[PDB]
Design a protein around this ligand. Structure first.
Ligand SMILES: [K+]
Ligand SMILES: [K+]
Ligand SMILES: [K+]
Ligand SMILES: [K+]
Ligand SMILES: [Mg+2]
Ligand SMILES: [Mg+2]
Ligand SMILES: [Mg+2]
Ligand SMILES: [Mg+2]
Ligand SMILES: [Mg+2]
Ligand SMILES: [Mg+2]
Ligand SMILES: [Zn+2]
Lengths: 238, 94, 92
RNA sequence: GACCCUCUUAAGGUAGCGUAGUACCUUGUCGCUUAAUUGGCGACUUGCAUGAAUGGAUCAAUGAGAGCCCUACUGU
RNA sequence: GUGUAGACAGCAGGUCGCAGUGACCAGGGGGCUCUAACUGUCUAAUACCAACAUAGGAGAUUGCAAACCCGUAAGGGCUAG
RNA sequence: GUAAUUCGAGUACGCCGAAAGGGAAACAGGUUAAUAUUCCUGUACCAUUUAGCGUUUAGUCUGACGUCUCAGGGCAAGCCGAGCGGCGUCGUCGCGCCGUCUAAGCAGCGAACCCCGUGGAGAGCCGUAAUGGCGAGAAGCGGGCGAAUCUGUAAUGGCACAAGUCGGCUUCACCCCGGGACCCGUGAAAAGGACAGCUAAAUGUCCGUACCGAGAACUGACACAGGUGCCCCUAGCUGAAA
């Protein structure tokens, strides 16, 4: 058994690959709202989220529950966040995407209604509402894909705060090191061609090279799915 | 009013803290980012250039205490302002 | 109107600043108060309902300053004497 | 030794670099460096068997990295 | 002379020695090349390197009941994403 | 779940996990051959239970926080001059050294920050070491809140029952307080405490405590030139300096 790969080590769940969950502020999700209900809350603070490197808003709701929300750009302390099917479609409000006009920017979008918000959550990203239909509503993802969602899926109106985070180059291994201390990701990473053959499919050889094509089949088993996985194509576009 | 901007000194800007490290391209990028982020930013609540970054994406007004979530290095992005202008045009039209 | 606001200060008694404006409203010596687009209403609805008229300026407190000779900002601008002016009629 | 054809059983090395940490022949030829240098550097290069993220060329700063030279220093 | 002060900086004159940072402590310097950009890591006990890492550049998969991965299962890592 | 388990992830409920994190409260002197904030003397303090005397403000604050840099105040140590008391030196001189002490507790004052009341400041004024501040209310003037430390008391204890009295300078590497800068890094939690307690009596169990802590008490077979630990501390001169 030429040793297991880094991906298999991470799947094992060892401490080297686990997130420092105790360092994080909140499991960001929409407040739980019953069918045909609404809740209002006011923003009391804007805090740094170590798990995302983007601000989060602390919201005190009418029901006596205090919750951390994924902050949209422009959300300010003292703002009244409304969440409901009848809520005004305004930045920071959590409304169903069936009530959002075409061309509006949404974020923290539920995969299914009441899911808590799955898509469009990183700093600066946003989704655009494209079409409305009777049972489906379509949005353009930050990836460019068109996603057909239930119109009852809730989303906060606006874009995610923290835009331009990666415009500043790391410039230095130490800065990225400090970012990686709060993440599960292993830093730094050794290239596979630099490893021995017992440690990677690409390892070994008198000189550094994979020895086999780096595009691997989608059928390849664990310990073998390395390099370009099921690549449609390779190279820079001609 | 500013530093002794010598005959050659106006290139590194705040990226002079890095010396000859990291290449000219990324030093220029970081220097431009610092210049844009250190600029005065007008408060949307009191309308004076007193908005400073309190954290990564967190901005506060030194006068009125207005704190909000914005860009990482800029209080207001162009996409967010586009959203605001779309909603404002809709509101005006009706 | 480009001189009426300016004429109200060139030849008129006014007191700029929310503290002195509130004092003038309290004692009544102010014919009215001129408030910017940014002034709250937690202490202002009481002065509105009173016989002191409340006027709304077409711009923020930052720009209401420079139209009245003051390099600084003015939020509440209770006038005292119109003088060579009839600004009270324009207010109401 | 450019240019028509070939041999083309996909194509036939572009920019560069080049006797290289890659050059077998080989201590290659020339120039500087020495009294004299299988050396170092520069140029030329018929590249046994260079070449573009199997990254090419190049490079300020950095280096207990590898060579050569000048000066100073010395029981080497 | 500066300074509230502690002190610090400077001047004039005289003078001894072979020698005044007198001991102690304490860079030798420069030129031309190869190579790796750099700080960093490494064969604990023969290899501190041009090897590893790095920021930068590029490609690939995946819209999340995802991609990738662990488990015989129950269920997990990545993911308070 | 597993063929099954002493095996297995998750969930729920519990429970443990720090002699360097948080944390109710004690000091000086003496005493032994060897223990001493533990015994003794003196002077304190904390917690619970009980009894009496009175009661919520209630949910907040505190505990409770990173890196770098800097101002102000204090202070252990250090240094200088005078007096006093010893010792040394004394070929000449009159210098050199040592000492000239003093705990907690209790009471008193309170710098910065912050807040409140007046005030009305721009062809600009007020500040800082620096950044700064200001009609969205500067300076100035009053008030409140609020430190380290200092002062007194404890003042009779120890000292050759020898002196024991004074001043000044500086102050790290310690304490208090405030500012600024940085972060694609944001720097713990919970117990406990405070906000209504005063007086009296009783109670405060259990475990550790010697000594070494290393060129001989640990570890490396050793009274081992290694390692653990240089982990935390350190006087005068020279000198930037440990
Ligand atoms: K591995
Ligand atoms: K790598
Ligand atoms: K490159
Ligand atoms: K002991
Ligand atoms: Mg293999
Ligand atoms: Mg030689
Ligand atoms: Mg190519
Ligand atoms: Mg290197
Ligand atoms: Mg490498
Ligand atoms: Mg415990
Ligand atoms: Zn503002």
């Amino acid at each position: 058994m030429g040793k297991r790969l880094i991906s298999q080590n991470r799947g094992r769940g060892t401490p080297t690959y686990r997130a420092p969950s105790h360092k994080y502020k909140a499991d960001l999700r929409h407040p739980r709202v019953d069918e045909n209900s609404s809740l209002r809350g006011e923003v009391v603070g804007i805090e740094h989220d170590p798990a995302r490197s983007a601000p989060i808003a602390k919201v005190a709701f009418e029901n006596g529950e205090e919750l951390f929300l994924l902050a949209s750009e422009g959300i300010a302390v003292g703002n009244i966040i409304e969440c409901g099917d009848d809520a005004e479609v305004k930045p920071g409000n959590i409304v169903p995407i069936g009530n959002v006009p075409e061309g509006f920017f949404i974020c923290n979008v539920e995969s299914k209604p009441n899911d808590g918000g799955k898509f469009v959550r990183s700093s600066g990203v946003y989704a655009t509402v494209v079409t409305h239909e009777a049972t489906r509503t379509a949005v353009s993802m930050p990836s460019g894909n068109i996603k057909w969602l239930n119109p009852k899926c809730r989303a906060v109106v606006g874009i995610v705060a923290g835009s331009g985070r990666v415009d500043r180059p790391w410039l230095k291994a130490g800065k990225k090191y400090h970012k990686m201390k709060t993440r599960a990701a292993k830093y730094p990473r050794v290239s596979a061609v630099a490893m021995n053959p017992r440690d990677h499919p690409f390892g070994g050889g008198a000189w550094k090279h994979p020895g086999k094509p780096t595009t691997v089949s989608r059928n390849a088993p664990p310990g073998r799915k390395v390099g370009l996985i099921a690549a449609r194509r390779t190279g820079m576009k001609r | 009013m500013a530093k002794k901007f010598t005959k050659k000194g106006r290139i590194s800007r705040s990226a002079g803290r890095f010396g000859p490290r990291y290449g000219r391209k990324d030093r220029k990028l970081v220097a431009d980012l610092e210049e844009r982020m250190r600029a005065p930013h007008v408060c949307t609540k009191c309308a004076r250039p007193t908005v400073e970054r309190i954290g990564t994406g967190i901005w506060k007004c030194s006068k009125c205490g207005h704190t909000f979530a914005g860009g990482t290095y800029i209080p207001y992005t162009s996409v967010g302002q586009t959203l605001l202008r779309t909603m404002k045009n809709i509101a005006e039209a009706k | 109107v480009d001189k009426s606001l300016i004429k109200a200060v060139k030849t008129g008694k006014v007191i700029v600043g929310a503290n002195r404006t509130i004092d003038a409203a309290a004692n009544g010596s102010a014919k009215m108060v001129v408030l910017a687009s940014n002034c709250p209403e937690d202490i202002k609805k009481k002065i509105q309902a009173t016989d002191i008229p409340v006027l709304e300026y077409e711009g923020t407190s930052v720009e209401l300053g420079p139209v009245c000779g003051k390099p600084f900002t003015i939020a509440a601008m209770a006038i005292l004497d119109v003088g060579e002016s009839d600004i009270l009629a324009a207010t109401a």
